[PDB]
Amino acid sequence: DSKPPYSYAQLIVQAITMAPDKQLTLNGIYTHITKNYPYYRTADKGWQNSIRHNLSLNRYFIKVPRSQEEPGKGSFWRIDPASESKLIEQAFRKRRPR
């Protein structure tokens, strides 16, 4: 299993919208990607740093506080509705080999 032809943001977007209510925890994001693209092993922290970096930089990823009744670590991440259609449209557009 090799490195998929997608950017980290595209992968985040793939994972986020593939979730029941379209929102995930950082953890959830790592799980989705590692499950559907084994290349990214949960033991390599490299790409994970990359995921976090993309969540913060890219302005279209919004953080959602955990309900007070379910106090876990880290919040929920979801696509900004404003650009959801844009991001989702190209989330699966494979890119030319890097």
Next chain:
Amino acid sequence: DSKPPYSYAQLIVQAITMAPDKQLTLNGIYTHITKNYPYYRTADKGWQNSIRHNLSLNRYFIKVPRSQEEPGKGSFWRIDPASESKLIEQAFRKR
């Protein structure tokens, strides 16, 4: 009065190097910092979590198992031998 121009790793190097056996317990590290740099008050625990985090993170600081000089307050912390000299020279390099 004002936040010193040093990282937490630097303050720690400062504090340990300053102790006699050249080693300190977290508590000792805290007290050294707020005594020399009043800005850090034992009231704001923000920087204190930082100190504990920096101790665990940095492969620069080694944890020494404590015997019984205190059956109620953690281990001792001293600087990595191979890098001690480098750190000492950098401990006060304002950044």
Next chain:
DNA sequence: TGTTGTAAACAATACA
């Protein structure tokens, strides 16, 4: 030029 990949510095927060 504008975008994406990596690495890392540096904290905040959760929690064992």
Next chain:
DNA sequence: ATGTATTGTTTACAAC
């Protein structure tokens, strides 16, 4: 109160 792991923000620079 001690100590460690995760989660998040932000820079700097390389690769595309």
